[PDB]
Scaffold this active site. Structure first.
Site, PDB file in Angstrom:
ATOM      1  N   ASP A   7      20.266  15.845  17.644  1.00  4.44           N
ATOM      2  CA  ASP A   7      19.950  14.869  16.585  1.00  4.44           C
ATOM      3  C   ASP A   7      18.742  14.045  17.023  1.00  4.44           C
ATOM      4  OD1 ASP A   7      19.702  12.561  15.051  1.00  4.44           O
ATOM      5  OD2 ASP A   7      21.850  12.447  14.634  1.00  4.44           O
ATOM      6  N   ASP A 105      16.956  16.783  10.652  1.00  4.99           N
ATOM      7  CA  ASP A 105      17.096  15.861  11.758  1.00  4.99           C
ATOM      8  C   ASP A 105      18.167  16.296  12.736  1.00  4.99           C
ATOM      9  OD1 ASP A 105      19.311  13.453  12.144  1.00  4.99           O
ATOM     10  OD2 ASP A 105      17.349  12.703  12.695  1.00  4.99           O
ATOM     11  N   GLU A 106      18.977  17.295  12.386  1.00  6.35           N
ATOM     12  CA  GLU A 106      20.210  17.648  13.063  1.00  6.35           C
ATOM     13  C   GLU A 106      20.388  19.157  12.999  1.00  6.35           C
ATOM     14  OE1 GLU A 106      23.478  15.703  11.297  1.00  6.35           O
ATOM     15  OE2 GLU A 106      22.827  13.669  11.808  1.00  6.35           O
TER      16      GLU A 106
HETATM   17  N1  LIG Z   1      19.470   5.811   3.162  1.00  2.00           N
HETATM   18  C1  LIG Z   1      18.522   6.752   3.731  1.00  2.00           C
HETATM   19  N2  LIG Z   1      17.570   6.877   2.810  1.00  2.00           N
HETATM   20  C2  LIG Z   1      16.502   7.698   3.042  1.00  2.00           C
HETATM   21  N3  LIG Z   1      16.413   8.392   4.209  1.00  2.00           N
HETATM   22  C3  LIG Z   1      17.399   8.267   5.149  1.00  2.00           C
HETATM   23  C4  LIG Z   1      18.447   7.459   4.914  1.00  2.00           C
HETATM   24  N4  LIG Z   1      19.264   7.468   5.976  1.00  2.00           N
HETATM   25  C5  LIG Z   1      18.731   8.278   6.881  1.00  2.00           C
HETATM   26  N5  LIG Z   1      17.608   8.774   6.389  1.00  2.00           N
HETATM   27  C6  LIG Z   1      16.513   9.696   6.793  1.00  2.00           C
HETATM   28  C7  LIG Z   1      15.490   9.018   7.718  1.00  2.00           C
HETATM   29  C8  LIG Z   1      16.053   9.327   9.152  1.00  2.00           C
HETATM   30  O1  LIG Z   1      14.936   9.201  10.167  1.00  2.00           O
HETATM   31  C9  LIG Z   1      16.542  10.531   9.041  1.00  2.00           C
HETATM   32  C10 LIG Z   1      17.757  10.808   9.887  1.00  2.00           C
HETATM   33  O2  LIG Z   1      18.942  10.168   9.498  1.00  2.00           O
HETATM   34  P1  LIG Z   1      19.793   9.572  10.798  1.00  2.00           P
HETATM   35  O3  LIG Z   1      19.834  10.594  11.922  1.00  2.00           O
HETATM   36  O4  LIG Z   1      21.175   8.962  10.583  1.00  2.00           O
HETATM   37  O5  LIG Z   1      18.685   8.369  11.002  1.00  2.00           O
HETATM   38  P2  LIG Z   1      17.683   8.038  12.255  1.00  2.00           P
HETATM   39  O6  LIG Z   1      17.133   9.326  12.842  1.00  2.00           O
HETATM   40  O7  LIG Z   1      16.600   7.100  11.804  1.00  2.00           O
HETATM   41  O8  LIG Z   1      18.614   7.136  13.192  1.00  2.00           O
HETATM   42  P3  LIG Z   1      19.431   7.744  14.445  1.00  2.00           P
HETATM   43  O9  LIG Z   1      18.570   7.421  15.672  1.00  2.00           O
HETATM   44  O10 LIG Z   1      20.768   7.011  14.407  1.00  2.00           O
HETATM   45  O11 LIG Z   1      19.620   9.247  14.256  1.00  2.00           O
HETATM   46  O12 LIG Z   1      17.046  10.681   7.526  1.00  2.00           O
HETATM   47 CA   LIG Z   2      21.893  11.966  11.941  1.00  2.00          CA
HETATM   48 CA   LIG Z   3      18.601  10.989  13.979  1.00  2.00          CA
END
Ligand SMILES: Nc1ncnc2c1ncn2[C@H]1C[C@H](O)[C@@H](COP(=O)(O)OP(=O)(O)OP(=O)(O)O)O1
Ligand SMILES: [Ca+2]
Ligand SMILES: [Ca+2]
Length: 341
Positions: A7, A105-106
């Site tokens: 991730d 992202d995953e």
């Molecule tokens: N409400 C949202 N609206 C639009 N895009 C989002 C939203 N939530 C997450 N994302 C998008 C942007 C993130 O960079 C990407 C990955 O989600 P996530 O992995 O949970 O966030 P992140 O990569 O910024 O934080 P983390 O470090 O916790 O993984 O998806």
């Molecule tokens: Ca995630």
């Molecule tokens: Ca992430």
DNA sequence: GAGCGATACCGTGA
DNA sequence: GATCACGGTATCGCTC
């Protein structure tokens, strides 16, 4: 099996950093501006530096402008983030033929065949972390465990830039000790139906009548949560297949005037047919977000592919059908194509 | 009673 | 003030 979860840390913000290293450390905030007034929109994501004072995904850009008037506020270039994800994904294919690209992202690897235990797995975790950092200057978190669910949970503890295994003893611990709100797939509305039932751990779901769970959350999560608690969950890594594609846009003013709305709706269809590239939908749905924020959709499957001209004509009939069946004003409008050939 | 398509719902930012 | 995108599921009427 042995699943490795990867991730990418604060992904949109990290890629922004890498494309201009001057931002490192400064708080960075990737926004979705919607163009109804100044800074109207939402915060897509934000590096951890900015995340420290309140600015997370989903909250308004105005409430975010409050907490950090002085941060750097970039617009979201999803197309850029995609291109560099694709690559990181391609790097991960040299560590297993079995891969589930779960999102931008995953992604999960079934590495059971590539190692023999959790220490050999783990030392893969570093091989891969180190590879992505060298090749693209992104940092990522890794979750290692016996199935996809607990490998996501390994990662969601160890982040940011972390790595964590969950041996079978630790799994046994968490079915007992872990809160059910921290299970993948248990969001707000359901964590409540579960507090309202005395279930606050997984293991708690075994010692209750199964139709009592079925009644409340549905046979699906019931059977989901149970198997997790009986340690009988085990779902195979499998490549996903985009089943739908669409675009919803926001209107500078609300409305229920069909001719005010049409331009926005034809725009959603161009952005949609560009995303579609070479794919031929047989189904189209028009999707109105009401000013109340409830979501409404009308649809039609054809027995044949949908030309853009078709999409235009049907889209407008499906909209009129939405204006009759509901009286509220519409805030956002878009389409969504499915059932590809 | 169940299969099947339309639609709404929840989740998760899978 | 509330973006945008999307999968998987439950619910409701038609149907055999
Ligand atoms: N409400 C949202 N609206 C639009 N895009 C989002 C939203 N939530 C997450 N994302 C998008 C942007 C993130 O960079 C990407 C990955 O989600 P996530 O992995 O949970 O966030 P992140 O990569 O910024 O934080 P983390 O470090 O916790 O993984 O998806
Ligand atoms: Ca995630
Ligand atoms: Ca992430």
């Amino acid at each position: 099996m042995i699943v490795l979860f990867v991730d990418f840390d604060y992904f949109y913000a990290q890629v922004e950093e890498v494309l201009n290293p001057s931002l490192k450390g400064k708080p960075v905030v990737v926004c979705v501006f919607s163009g109804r007034f100044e800074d109207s929109g939402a915060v897509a994501t934000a590096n951890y530096e900015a995340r420290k004072f309140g600015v997370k995904a989903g909250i308004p850009i105005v409430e975010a402008k409050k907490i950090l008037p002085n941060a750097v506020y970039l617009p979201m270039r999803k197309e850029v983030y995609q291109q560099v994800s694709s690559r990181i994904m391609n790097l991960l294919r040299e560590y297993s033929e079995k891969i589930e690209i779960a999102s931008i992202d995953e992604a999960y690897l079934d590495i059971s065949d590539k190692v023999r235990d959790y220490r050999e797995a783990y030392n893969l975790g570093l091989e891969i972390k180190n590879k992505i950092l060298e090749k693209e200057k992104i940092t990522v978190t890794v979750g290692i465990s016996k199935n996809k669910v607990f490998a996501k949970i390994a990662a969601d503890m160890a982040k940011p830039n972390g790595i964590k295994v969950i041996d079978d003893e630790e799994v046994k611990r968490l079915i007992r000790e872990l809160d059910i709100a921290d299970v993948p797939g248990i969001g707000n509305i359901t964590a409540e139906k579960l507090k309202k039932l005395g279930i606050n751990k997984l293991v708690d779901t075994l010692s209750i009548e199964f139709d009592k769970l079925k009644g409340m959350i549905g046979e699906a999560k019931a059977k989901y949560l149970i198997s997790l608690a009986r340690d009988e969950y085990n779902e195979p890594i499998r490549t996903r297949v985009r089943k739908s594609i669409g675009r919803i846009v926001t209107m500078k003013r609300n409305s229920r005037n069909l001719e005010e709305i049409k331009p926005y709706l034809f725009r959603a269809i161009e952005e949609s047919y560009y995303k579609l590239d070479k794919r031929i939908p047989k189904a189209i749905h028009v999707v109105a977000v009401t000013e109340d924020l409830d979501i409404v959709s009308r649809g039609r499957t054809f027995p044949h592919g949908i030309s853009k001209e078709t999409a235009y004509s049907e889209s407008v009939k499906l909209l009129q059908k939405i204006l009759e069946e509901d009286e509220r004003k519409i805030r956002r409008i878009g389409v969504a194509f499915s059932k590809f050939i």
